[PDB]
Amino acid sequence: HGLKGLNSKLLDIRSYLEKVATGKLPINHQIIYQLQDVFNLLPDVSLQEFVKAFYLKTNDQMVVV
Amino acid sequence: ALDMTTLTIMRYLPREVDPLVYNMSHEDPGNVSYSEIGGLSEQIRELR
Amino acid sequence: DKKFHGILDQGEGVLIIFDEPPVDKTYEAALETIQNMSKVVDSLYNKAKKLT
Amino acid sequence: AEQVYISSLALLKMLKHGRAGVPMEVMGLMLGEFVDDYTVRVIDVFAMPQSGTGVSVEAVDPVFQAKMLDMLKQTGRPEMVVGWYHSHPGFGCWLSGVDINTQQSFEALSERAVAVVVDPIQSVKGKVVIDAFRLIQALIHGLNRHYYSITINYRKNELEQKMLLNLHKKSWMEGLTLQDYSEHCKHNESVVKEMLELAKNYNKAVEEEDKMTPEQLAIKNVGKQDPKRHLEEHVDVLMTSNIVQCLAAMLDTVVFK
Amino acid sequence: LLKLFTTMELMRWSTLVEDYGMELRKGSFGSTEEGEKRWKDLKNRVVEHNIRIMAKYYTRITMKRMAQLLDLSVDESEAFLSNLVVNKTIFAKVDRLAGIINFQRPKDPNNLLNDWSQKLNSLMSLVNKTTHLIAKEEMIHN
Lengths: 65, 48, 52, 257, 142
Prior knowledge:
This is part of a larger assembly, with chains A, B, C, D and E.
Chain A: H1 2-21, H2 29-40, H3 50-64
Chain C: E1 6-9, E2 14-17, H1 25-51
Antiparallel strand pairs in C: 1-2
Chain E: H1 2-6, H2 13-26, H3 37-57, E1 60-62, H4 64-69, H5 74-86, E2 93-95, E3 100-102, H6 109-140
Antiparallel strand pairs in E: 1-3, 2-3
Helix pairs in contact in E: 3-5
Protein backbone atom coordinates (compact mmCIF):
# COMPACT_ATOMS: atom_id res chain seq x y z
CA HIS A 1 0.00 0.00 0.00
CA GLY A 2 2.90 2.34 0.82
CA LEU A 3 4.77 1.36 -2.45
CA LYS A 4 1.70 2.27 -4.50
CA GLY A 5 1.61 5.55 -2.57
CA LEU A 6 5.24 6.35 -3.40
CA ASN A 7 4.90 5.73 -7.13
CA SER A 8 2.05 8.23 -7.09
CA LYS A 9 3.95 11.10 -5.51
CA LEU A 10 6.85 10.65 -7.91
CA LEU A 11 4.49 10.91 -10.92
CA ASP A 12 3.13 14.12 -9.45
CA ILE A 13 6.50 15.77 -9.17
CA ARG A 14 7.57 14.43 -12.57
CA SER A 15 4.85 15.73 -14.87
CA TYR A 16 4.66 18.91 -12.84
CA LEU A 17 8.30 19.70 -13.61
CA GLU A 18 7.29 19.09 -17.20
CA LYS A 19 4.64 21.78 -16.72
CA VAL A 20 7.46 23.71 -15.33
CA ALA A 21 9.25 23.26 -18.65
CA THR A 22 5.92 23.62 -20.48
CA GLY A 23 2.89 24.49 -18.34
CA LYS A 24 4.25 28.00 -18.14
CA LEU A 25 6.37 26.95 -15.15
CA PRO A 26 6.86 30.18 -13.17
CA ILE A 27 9.97 29.17 -11.20
CA ASN A 28 9.22 28.03 -7.63
CA HIS A 29 12.94 28.00 -6.85
CA GLN A 30 11.60 26.89 -3.45
CA ILE A 31 10.41 23.57 -4.82
CA ILE A 32 13.46 22.83 -6.94
CA TYR A 33 15.65 23.38 -3.88
CA GLN A 34 13.62 20.71 -2.10
CA LEU A 35 13.90 18.27 -4.99
CA GLN A 36 17.66 18.67 -4.93
CA ASP A 37 17.55 18.08 -1.19
CA VAL A 38 15.65 14.91 -2.00
CA PHE A 39 18.49 13.76 -4.18
CA ASN A 40 21.16 14.78 -1.69
CA LEU A 41 19.36 12.62 0.87
CA LEU A 42 19.28 9.68 -1.51
CA PRO A 43 21.06 6.82 0.12
CA ASP A 44 23.51 5.64 -2.35
CA VAL A 45 25.82 3.16 -2.21
CA SER A 46 26.28 -0.52 -2.08
CA LEU A 47 29.43 0.77 -0.28
CA GLN A 48 31.76 -1.62 1.55
CA GLU A 49 30.23 0.02 4.63
CA PHE A 50 26.51 -0.58 4.07
CA VAL A 51 27.09 -3.96 2.39
CA LYS A 52 28.37 -5.03 5.81
CA ALA A 53 25.76 -3.28 7.97
CA PHE A 54 22.80 -4.93 6.23
CA TYR A 55 24.71 -8.21 6.19
CA LEU A 56 25.50 -8.16 9.89
CA LYS A 57 21.89 -7.23 10.54
CA THR A 58 20.23 -9.85 8.35
CA ASN A 59 22.14 -12.58 10.14
CA ASP A 60 20.78 -11.45 13.53
CA GLN A 61 17.34 -11.85 11.97
CA MET A 62 18.19 -15.36 10.79
CA VAL A 63 19.17 -16.45 14.31
CA VAL A 64 15.84 -15.24 15.65
CA VAL A 65 13.98 -16.93 12.81
CA ALA B 1 -21.52 9.57 44.40
CA LEU B 2 -22.56 6.44 42.58
CA ASP B 3 -25.41 5.43 40.35
CA MET B 4 -28.34 3.21 41.32
CA THR B 5 -28.67 1.46 37.95
CA THR B 6 -25.86 2.58 35.68
CA LEU B 7 -23.91 2.09 38.88
CA THR B 8 -21.21 4.55 37.90
CA ILE B 9 -19.91 7.69 39.45
CA MET B 10 -22.70 10.13 40.02
CA ARG B 11 -20.37 12.74 41.51
CA TYR B 12 -17.41 12.56 43.86
CA LEU B 13 -17.94 14.04 47.33
CA PRO B 14 -15.68 14.86 50.28
CA ARG B 15 -14.86 12.99 53.51
CA GLU B 16 -18.02 13.03 55.63
CA VAL B 17 -17.93 13.08 59.42
CA ASP B 18 -20.96 11.09 60.48
CA PRO B 19 -23.65 12.47 62.74
CA LEU B 20 -21.40 12.15 65.80
CA VAL B 21 -18.50 14.41 64.93
CA TYR B 22 -20.91 17.36 64.93
CA ASN B 23 -22.13 16.92 68.49
CA MET B 24 -18.53 16.94 69.79
CA SER B 25 -17.42 19.50 67.22
CA HIS B 26 -19.81 22.31 66.38
CA GLU B 27 -22.10 21.48 69.31
CA ASP B 28 -20.51 21.22 72.71
CA PRO B 29 -20.61 24.92 73.54
CA GLY B 30 -18.07 25.70 76.32
CA ASN B 31 -19.00 28.28 78.99
CA VAL B 32 -17.30 31.16 80.79
CA SER B 33 -13.53 31.58 80.44
CA TYR B 34 -10.97 30.07 82.81
CA SER B 35 -11.43 32.88 85.32
CA GLU B 36 -14.76 31.28 86.22
CA ILE B 37 -12.82 28.72 88.26
CA GLY B 38 -9.48 28.30 89.89
CA GLY B 39 -8.10 27.59 93.32
CA LEU B 40 -4.84 26.36 91.72
CA SER B 41 -3.41 28.35 88.82
CA GLU B 42 -1.28 25.20 88.78
CA GLN B 43 -3.08 23.21 86.09
CA ILE B 44 -4.79 26.25 84.59
CA ARG B 45 -1.32 27.65 83.64
CA GLU B 46 0.24 24.20 83.32
CA LEU B 47 -2.32 23.01 80.79
CA ARG B 48 -2.44 26.30 78.93
CA ASP C 1 44.46 -11.41 32.42
CA LYS C 2 41.87 -10.05 29.96
CA LYS C 3 42.04 -6.61 31.56
CA PHE C 4 42.22 -4.23 28.59
CA HIS C 5 41.92 -6.33 25.40
CA GLY C 6 44.97 -5.62 23.24
CA ILE C 7 48.17 -7.17 21.96
CA LEU C 8 51.89 -6.36 22.03
CA ASP C 9 53.94 -6.23 18.85
CA GLN C 10 57.51 -6.63 19.99
CA GLY C 11 58.84 -6.40 16.44
CA GLU C 12 58.14 -2.69 16.27
CA GLY C 13 58.01 -2.09 20.03
CA VAL C 14 54.32 -1.25 19.84
CA LEU C 15 51.25 -1.84 21.93
CA ILE C 16 47.86 -2.22 20.27
CA ILE C 17 44.62 -1.76 22.14
CA PHE C 18 41.20 -2.89 20.99
CA ASP C 19 37.61 -1.97 21.91
CA GLU C 20 35.93 -5.36 22.27
CA PRO C 21 32.15 -5.54 22.86
CA PRO C 22 30.84 -8.17 20.41
CA VAL C 23 30.08 -11.19 22.64
CA ASP C 24 26.46 -10.97 21.57
CA LYS C 25 23.73 -11.83 24.04
CA THR C 26 21.04 -12.79 21.51
CA TYR C 27 23.02 -15.55 19.88
CA GLU C 28 23.88 -16.78 23.39
CA ALA C 29 20.24 -17.13 24.44
CA ALA C 30 19.58 -18.81 21.09
CA LEU C 31 22.22 -21.44 21.82
CA GLU C 32 20.82 -21.92 25.31
CA THR C 33 17.34 -22.41 23.86
CA ILE C 34 18.73 -25.15 21.62
CA GLN C 35 19.93 -26.94 24.76
CA ASN C 36 16.56 -26.84 26.56
CA MET C 37 14.89 -28.03 23.35
CA SER C 38 17.41 -30.82 22.82
CA LYS C 39 16.18 -32.02 26.26
CA VAL C 40 12.51 -31.62 25.36
CA VAL C 41 12.87 -33.64 22.20
CA ASP C 42 14.21 -36.64 24.06
CA SER C 43 11.43 -36.44 26.60
CA LEU C 44 8.88 -36.08 23.80
CA TYR C 45 10.14 -39.25 22.11
CA ASN C 46 10.09 -41.06 25.44
CA LYS C 47 6.28 -40.86 25.20
CA ALA C 48 6.11 -41.70 21.49
CA LYS C 49 7.69 -45.17 21.79
CA LYS C 50 5.04 -45.74 24.47
CA LEU C 51 2.14 -44.46 22.36
CA THR C 52 3.49 -46.30 19.31
CA ALA D 1 -43.24 -7.59 8.54
CA GLU D 2 -42.95 -3.94 9.53
CA GLN D 3 -39.49 -2.41 9.52
CA VAL D 4 -37.36 0.68 9.77
CA TYR D 5 -34.28 1.64 7.81
CA ILE D 6 -31.69 3.60 9.74
CA SER D 7 -29.15 5.48 7.66
CA SER D 8 -25.52 5.28 8.70
CA LEU D 9 -25.11 8.92 9.76
CA ALA D 10 -28.15 8.48 11.97
CA LEU D 11 -26.71 5.45 13.72
CA LEU D 12 -23.29 6.96 14.29
CA LYS D 13 -24.68 10.28 15.59
CA MET D 14 -26.89 8.13 17.77
CA LEU D 15 -24.18 6.02 19.39
CA LYS D 16 -21.99 9.06 19.72
CA HIS D 17 -24.49 11.11 21.68
CA GLY D 18 -25.48 8.11 23.78
CA ARG D 19 -21.91 7.16 24.59
CA ALA D 20 -21.25 10.80 25.43
CA GLY D 21 -24.10 11.13 27.88
CA VAL D 22 -23.34 8.17 30.13
CA PRO D 23 -25.13 7.71 32.29
CA MET D 24 -28.03 10.14 32.11
CA GLU D 25 -30.56 8.76 29.61
CA VAL D 26 -30.22 11.44 26.93
CA MET D 27 -32.75 11.88 24.15
CA GLY D 28 -33.23 13.26 20.69
CA LEU D 29 -35.45 13.28 17.66
CA MET D 30 -35.56 11.33 14.47
CA LEU D 31 -36.08 12.73 10.98
CA GLY D 32 -37.46 10.59 8.23
CA GLU D 33 -40.40 9.56 6.16
CA PHE D 34 -43.09 6.86 6.22
CA VAL D 35 -42.89 4.90 2.98
CA ASP D 36 -45.91 2.66 3.49
CA ASP D 37 -47.68 1.00 6.37
CA TYR D 38 -44.79 -1.49 6.46
CA THR D 39 -41.88 0.93 6.66
CA VAL D 40 -40.34 3.90 8.44
CA ARG D 41 -37.14 5.47 7.16
CA VAL D 42 -34.87 7.49 9.41
CA ILE D 43 -32.33 9.50 7.50
CA ASP D 44 -31.40 12.14 10.11
CA VAL D 45 -31.18 12.84 13.82
CA PHE D 46 -30.57 15.80 16.10
CA ALA D 47 -29.84 15.88 19.81
CA MET D 48 -32.07 17.25 22.53
CA PRO D 49 -30.51 19.14 25.46
CA GLN D 50 -30.32 17.73 28.97
CA SER D 51 -32.22 18.75 32.08
CA GLY D 52 -32.16 18.46 35.87
CA THR D 53 -34.19 15.32 35.23
CA GLY D 54 -33.98 12.29 32.95
CA VAL D 55 -35.84 11.89 29.68
CA SER D 56 -39.53 12.77 29.82
CA VAL D 57 -42.27 14.64 28.00
CA GLU D 58 -41.22 18.21 28.80
CA ALA D 59 -37.62 17.20 28.10
CA VAL D 60 -38.75 17.75 24.53
CA ASP D 61 -38.08 21.42 23.93
CA PRO D 62 -40.39 23.06 21.41
CA VAL D 63 -38.29 26.24 21.09
CA PHE D 64 -35.17 24.18 20.54
CA GLN D 65 -37.02 21.81 18.23
CA ALA D 66 -38.55 24.20 15.69
CA LYS D 67 -35.47 26.39 16.09
CA MET D 68 -33.58 23.40 14.70
CA LEU D 69 -36.30 22.54 12.19
CA ASP D 70 -36.24 25.75 10.15
CA MET D 71 -32.48 25.83 10.49
CA LEU D 72 -32.41 22.53 8.70
CA LYS D 73 -35.02 23.70 6.19
CA GLN D 74 -32.44 26.18 4.96
CA THR D 75 -30.23 23.13 4.38
CA GLY D 76 -32.95 21.11 2.63
CA ARG D 77 -33.19 18.40 5.27
CA PRO D 78 -36.98 18.75 5.41
CA GLU D 79 -38.57 15.66 6.95
CA MET D 80 -41.15 14.71 9.54
CA VAL D 81 -40.28 13.91 13.10
CA VAL D 82 -40.80 10.17 12.84
CA GLY D 83 -39.60 8.96 16.22
CA TRP D 84 -37.38 9.75 19.12
CA TYR D 85 -34.23 8.12 20.33
CA HIS D 86 -33.24 7.63 23.82
CA SER D 87 -30.81 5.54 25.78
CA HIS D 88 -30.98 3.13 28.67
CA PRO D 89 -27.30 2.61 29.42
CA GLY D 90 -26.63 -0.68 31.13
CA PHE D 91 -30.29 -1.63 31.40
CA GLY D 92 -30.80 -3.11 27.96
CA CYS D 93 -33.50 -2.11 25.52
CA TRP D 94 -37.02 -1.62 26.87
CA LEU D 95 -39.43 1.20 27.70
CA SER D 96 -40.14 2.20 31.23
CA GLY D 97 -43.70 3.36 31.85
CA VAL D 98 -42.30 6.86 31.88
CA ASP D 99 -40.83 6.08 28.48
CA ILE D 100 -44.34 4.93 27.55
CA ASN D 101 -46.26 8.09 28.41
CA THR D 102 -43.89 10.13 26.32
CA GLN D 103 -44.22 7.62 23.51
CA GLN D 104 -47.96 8.38 23.63
CA SER D 105 -47.24 12.07 23.46
CA PHE D 106 -45.63 11.05 20.16
CA GLU D 107 -48.59 8.87 19.20
CA ALA D 108 -51.06 11.76 19.08
CA LEU D 109 -48.58 13.65 16.89
CA SER D 110 -48.38 10.75 14.41
CA GLU D 111 -49.91 7.32 14.89
CA ARG D 112 -46.91 5.61 13.32
CA ALA D 113 -44.22 7.31 15.39
CA VAL D 114 -41.73 4.90 16.89
CA ALA D 115 -39.49 4.66 19.91
CA VAL D 116 -35.82 3.92 19.55
CA VAL D 117 -33.82 2.76 22.53
CA VAL D 118 -30.04 2.70 22.31
CA ASP D 119 -27.84 1.13 24.92
CA PRO D 120 -24.40 2.70 24.83
CA ILE D 121 -22.34 0.71 27.30
CA GLN D 122 -23.25 -2.91 26.64
CA SER D 123 -23.34 -2.26 22.90
CA VAL D 124 -20.26 -4.23 21.99
CA LYS D 125 -17.94 -3.62 19.07
CA GLY D 126 -19.48 -6.56 17.22
CA LYS D 127 -23.24 -6.30 16.76
CA VAL D 128 -24.38 -2.93 18.04
CA VAL D 129 -27.47 -3.22 20.21
CA ILE D 130 -30.34 -1.08 19.03
CA ASP D 131 -34.06 -1.38 19.36
CA ALA D 132 -37.06 0.30 17.83
CA PHE D 133 -40.68 -0.40 18.59
CA ARG D 134 -44.01 1.09 19.59
CA LEU D 135 -46.84 0.69 22.02
CA ILE D 136 -50.29 -0.89 22.04
CA GLN D 137 -35.17 -9.33 30.00
CA ALA D 138 -37.60 -6.92 28.34
CA LEU D 139 -40.60 -9.15 29.06
CA ILE D 140 -40.36 -8.06 32.70
CA HIS D 141 -41.67 -4.73 31.43
CA GLY D 142 -44.23 -6.32 29.15
CA LEU D 143 -42.30 -6.40 25.90
CA ASN D 144 -45.45 -7.75 24.33
CA ARG D 145 -47.96 -6.45 26.88
CA HIS D 146 -47.99 -2.66 26.77
CA TYR D 147 -45.94 -2.38 23.60
CA TYR D 148 -44.40 -4.46 20.83
CA SER D 149 -41.06 -4.80 19.08
CA ILE D 150 -40.13 -3.83 15.52
CA THR D 151 -37.31 -4.63 13.11
CA ILE D 152 -34.39 -2.59 11.81
CA ASN D 153 -32.11 -2.33 8.77
CA TYR D 154 -29.60 0.16 7.39
CA ARG D 155 -29.65 2.10 4.12
CA LYS D 156 -26.18 1.98 2.59
CA ASN D 157 -23.85 3.33 -0.06
CA GLU D 158 -20.78 1.83 -1.72
CA LEU D 159 -18.84 5.00 -0.73
CA GLU D 160 -19.89 5.47 2.85
CA GLN D 161 -18.35 2.06 3.41
CA LYS D 162 -15.28 3.13 1.42
CA MET D 163 -14.63 5.98 3.81
CA LEU D 164 -15.10 3.65 6.74
CA LEU D 165 -12.54 1.16 5.36
CA ASN D 166 -9.69 3.63 5.83
CA LEU D 167 -10.86 3.86 9.45
CA HIS D 168 -8.46 1.10 10.53
CA LYS D 169 -5.98 1.83 7.74
CA LYS D 170 -2.45 3.23 8.16
CA SER D 171 -0.70 6.47 7.15
CA TRP D 172 1.06 7.48 3.96
CA MET D 173 4.79 7.57 4.73
CA GLU D 174 3.90 4.21 6.28
CA GLY D 175 5.10 0.92 4.79
CA LEU D 176 8.58 2.28 4.16
CA THR D 177 9.18 3.17 7.80
CA LEU D 178 11.83 1.16 9.62
CA GLN D 179 11.42 1.10 13.41
CA ASP D 180 14.58 1.82 15.42
CA TYR D 181 16.81 -1.19 14.74
CA SER D 182 18.92 -1.18 17.87
CA GLU D 183 15.68 -1.03 19.83
CA HIS D 184 14.32 -3.91 17.79
CA CYS D 185 17.34 -6.05 18.63
CA LYS D 186 16.27 -5.88 22.28
CA HIS D 187 12.99 -7.56 21.38
CA ASN D 188 14.82 -10.48 19.82
CA GLU D 189 17.48 -10.60 22.56
CA SER D 190 15.01 -9.86 25.35
CA VAL D 191 12.14 -11.79 23.78
CA VAL D 192 14.26 -14.86 23.06
CA LYS D 193 15.68 -14.70 26.58
CA GLU D 194 12.27 -14.68 28.19
CA MET D 195 11.41 -17.71 26.04
CA LEU D 196 14.49 -19.55 27.14
CA GLU D 197 13.26 -19.70 30.71
CA LEU D 198 10.03 -21.09 29.24
CA ALA D 199 11.75 -23.72 27.13
CA LYS D 200 12.48 -25.61 30.38
CA ASN D 201 8.87 -25.14 31.47
CA TYR D 202 7.56 -26.95 28.41
CA ASN D 203 10.09 -29.68 29.14
CA LYS D 204 8.85 -30.12 32.69
CA ALA D 205 5.22 -30.15 31.60
CA VAL D 206 5.87 -32.87 29.01
CA GLU D 207 7.88 -35.01 31.45
CA GLU D 208 5.18 -34.49 34.09
CA GLU D 209 1.68 -34.38 32.59
CA ASP D 210 3.07 -37.13 30.35
CA LYS D 211 1.44 -39.42 32.93
CA MET D 212 -2.07 -37.98 33.64
CA THR D 213 -5.61 -37.06 32.18
CA PRO D 214 -7.73 -33.94 31.43
CA GLU D 215 -9.56 -33.68 34.76
CA GLN D 216 -6.21 -33.93 36.54
CA LEU D 217 -5.00 -31.50 33.84
CA ALA D 218 -7.36 -28.66 34.88
CA ILE D 219 -5.82 -28.77 38.34
CA LYS D 220 -2.37 -28.21 36.81
CA ASN D 221 -2.95 -25.70 34.04
CA VAL D 222 -5.93 -23.55 35.56
CA GLY D 223 -3.39 -22.89 38.30
CA LYS D 224 -0.18 -21.98 36.51
CA GLN D 225 0.89 -20.96 33.03
CA ASP D 226 1.70 -23.87 30.76
CA PRO D 227 4.68 -22.96 28.60
CA LYS D 228 2.97 -24.27 25.47
CA ARG D 229 0.87 -21.20 24.59
CA HIS D 230 3.92 -19.15 25.53
CA LEU D 231 6.38 -20.63 23.08
CA GLU D 232 3.87 -20.70 20.24
CA GLU D 233 2.54 -17.23 21.02
CA HIS D 234 6.01 -15.87 21.70
CA VAL D 235 7.30 -17.21 18.39
CA ASP D 236 4.52 -15.23 16.71
CA VAL D 237 6.10 -11.87 17.55
CA LEU D 238 9.63 -12.92 16.58
CA MET D 239 8.38 -14.44 13.32
CA THR D 240 6.25 -11.68 11.85
CA SER D 241 7.98 -8.76 13.55
CA ASN D 242 11.33 -9.98 12.23
CA ILE D 243 9.98 -10.73 8.76
CA VAL D 244 8.44 -7.28 8.41
CA GLN D 245 11.65 -5.64 9.57
CA CYS D 246 13.76 -7.89 7.31
CA LEU D 247 11.40 -7.31 4.42
CA ALA D 248 11.20 -3.56 4.97
CA ALA D 249 14.97 -3.24 4.67
CA MET D 250 15.14 -5.46 1.60
CA LEU D 251 12.86 -2.96 -0.12
CA ASP D 252 14.40 0.24 1.14
CA THR D 253 17.85 -0.82 -0.02
CA VAL D 254 16.80 -1.76 -3.57
CA VAL D 255 13.93 0.68 -3.99
CA PHE D 256 15.38 3.76 -2.29
CA LYS D 257 18.60 4.44 -4.21
CA LEU E 1 35.87 38.14 22.93
CA LEU E 2 32.45 36.66 23.62
CA LYS E 3 31.69 36.65 19.92
CA LEU E 4 35.07 34.96 19.57
CA PHE E 5 34.10 32.01 21.75
CA THR E 6 30.61 31.69 20.36
CA THR E 7 31.65 31.02 16.76
CA MET E 8 33.35 27.79 15.73
CA GLU E 9 36.83 28.39 14.35
CA LEU E 10 40.50 28.00 15.23
CA MET E 11 41.71 30.42 17.88
CA ARG E 12 45.44 30.82 17.28
CA TRP E 13 46.49 31.89 20.77
CA SER E 14 49.12 34.50 19.93
CA THR E 15 46.88 36.85 17.97
CA LEU E 16 44.39 36.73 20.82
CA VAL E 17 47.01 37.64 23.43
CA GLU E 18 48.33 40.45 21.28
CA ASP E 19 44.97 42.03 20.53
CA TYR E 20 43.31 41.72 23.91
CA GLY E 21 46.46 41.60 26.51
CA MET E 22 46.54 45.34 27.01
CA GLU E 23 42.79 45.95 27.34
CA LEU E 24 42.50 43.04 29.75
CA ARG E 25 45.38 44.00 32.01
CA LYS E 26 44.14 47.59 32.35
CA GLY E 27 40.95 46.50 34.26
CA SER E 28 41.14 46.65 38.11
CA PHE E 29 43.93 38.78 35.20
CA GLY E 30 45.95 40.67 37.80
CA SER E 31 49.32 39.86 39.37
CA THR E 32 51.34 36.66 38.93
CA GLU E 33 49.65 35.01 41.92
CA GLU E 34 45.91 34.40 42.25
CA GLY E 35 45.05 36.56 39.24
CA GLU E 36 47.95 35.54 37.01
CA LYS E 37 46.74 31.99 37.60
CA ARG E 38 43.88 32.84 35.26
CA TRP E 39 46.32 33.26 32.39
CA LYS E 40 46.96 29.51 32.44
CA ASP E 41 43.26 28.67 32.45
CA LEU E 42 42.61 30.94 29.49
CA LYS E 43 45.23 28.98 27.60
CA ASN E 44 43.49 25.77 28.63
CA ARG E 45 40.07 27.02 27.47
CA VAL E 46 41.66 27.94 24.20
CA VAL E 47 43.08 24.46 23.72
CA GLU E 48 39.77 22.86 24.70
CA HIS E 49 38.20 25.20 22.18
CA ASN E 50 40.24 24.33 19.12
CA ILE E 51 40.38 20.67 20.01
CA ARG E 52 36.63 21.11 20.63
CA ILE E 53 35.91 22.27 17.07
CA MET E 54 38.34 20.03 15.19
CA ALA E 55 36.21 17.22 16.55
CA LYS E 56 33.39 18.75 14.55
CA TYR E 57 34.82 19.10 11.07
CA TYR E 58 37.79 16.76 10.69
CA THR E 59 36.87 13.08 10.45
CA ARG E 60 40.51 12.03 10.82
CA ILE E 61 43.55 14.09 11.64
CA THR E 62 47.32 13.68 11.78
CA MET E 63 49.94 14.73 14.34
CA LYS E 64 52.34 17.39 13.09
CA ARG E 65 49.66 19.41 11.31
CA MET E 66 47.43 19.06 14.36
CA ALA E 67 50.20 20.48 16.55
CA GLN E 68 50.59 23.34 14.08
CA LEU E 69 46.84 24.00 14.23
CA LEU E 70 46.95 23.95 18.03
CA ASP E 71 50.31 25.77 18.04
CA LEU E 72 51.50 23.47 20.82
CA SER E 73 54.02 20.77 19.90
CA VAL E 74 53.52 16.99 20.13
CA ASP E 75 53.51 17.15 23.92
CA GLU E 76 51.25 20.10 24.75
CA SER E 77 48.77 18.33 22.46
CA GLU E 78 48.92 14.70 23.58
CA ALA E 79 48.57 16.06 27.10
CA PHE E 80 45.58 18.27 26.28
CA LEU E 81 43.89 15.40 24.45
CA SER E 82 44.59 12.94 27.26
CA ASN E 83 43.05 15.21 29.88
CA LEU E 84 40.02 15.75 27.65
CA VAL E 85 39.50 12.02 27.13
CA VAL E 86 40.26 11.23 30.77
CA ASN E 87 37.71 13.71 32.04
CA LYS E 88 36.07 12.91 28.71
CA THR E 89 35.33 15.79 26.33
CA ILE E 90 35.86 14.10 22.98
CA PHE E 91 36.17 10.68 21.44
CA ALA E 92 39.61 10.53 19.87
CA LYS E 93 41.88 7.57 19.60
CA VAL E 94 45.46 7.83 18.66
CA ASP E 95 47.71 6.00 16.64
CA ARG E 96 51.05 6.76 18.21
CA LEU E 97 53.87 5.77 15.94
CA ALA E 98 54.47 9.41 14.87
CA GLY E 99 51.18 9.39 13.01
CA ILE E 100 47.55 10.06 13.52
CA ILE E 101 44.93 11.26 15.89
CA ASN E 102 41.59 9.65 15.11
CA PHE E 103 38.45 11.54 16.18
CA GLN E 104 35.66 9.40 14.72
CA ARG E 105 33.38 7.67 17.20
CA PRO E 106 33.14 3.87 17.09
CA LYS E 107 29.69 3.09 15.62
CA ASP E 108 28.42 -0.39 14.70
CA PRO E 109 26.34 -1.68 11.81
CA ASN E 110 23.40 -0.66 13.97
CA ASN E 111 24.59 2.93 14.20
CA LEU E 112 25.17 3.22 10.45
CA LEU E 113 21.76 1.72 9.85
CA ASN E 114 20.10 4.32 12.09
CA ASP E 115 21.48 7.08 9.86
CA TRP E 116 20.07 5.34 6.80
CA SER E 117 16.73 4.66 8.45
CA GLN E 118 16.62 8.28 9.63
CA LYS E 119 17.56 9.54 6.18
CA LEU E 120 14.74 7.57 4.56
CA ASN E 121 12.22 9.10 6.94
CA SER E 122 13.39 12.67 6.37
CA LEU E 123 13.20 12.10 2.61
CA MET E 124 9.55 11.06 2.89
CA SER E 125 8.65 14.45 4.31
CA LEU E 126 10.55 16.02 1.37
CA VAL E 127 8.56 13.77 -0.97
CA ASN E 128 5.29 14.54 1.10
CA LYS E 129 5.84 18.26 1.78
CA THR E 130 7.05 18.67 -1.71
CA THR E 131 3.52 17.41 -3.03
CA HIS E 132 1.21 20.43 -1.59
CA LEU E 133 3.43 23.02 -3.26
CA ILE E 134 2.99 21.31 -6.64
CA ALA E 135 -0.77 21.32 -6.09
CA LYS E 136 -0.91 24.81 -4.59
CA GLU E 137 0.50 26.16 -7.85
CA GLU E 138 -1.88 24.19 -10.07
CA MET E 139 -4.84 25.65 -8.16
CA ILE E 140 -3.34 29.14 -8.00
CA HIS E 141 -1.92 28.86 -11.54
CA ASN E 142 -3.81 26.62 -13.98
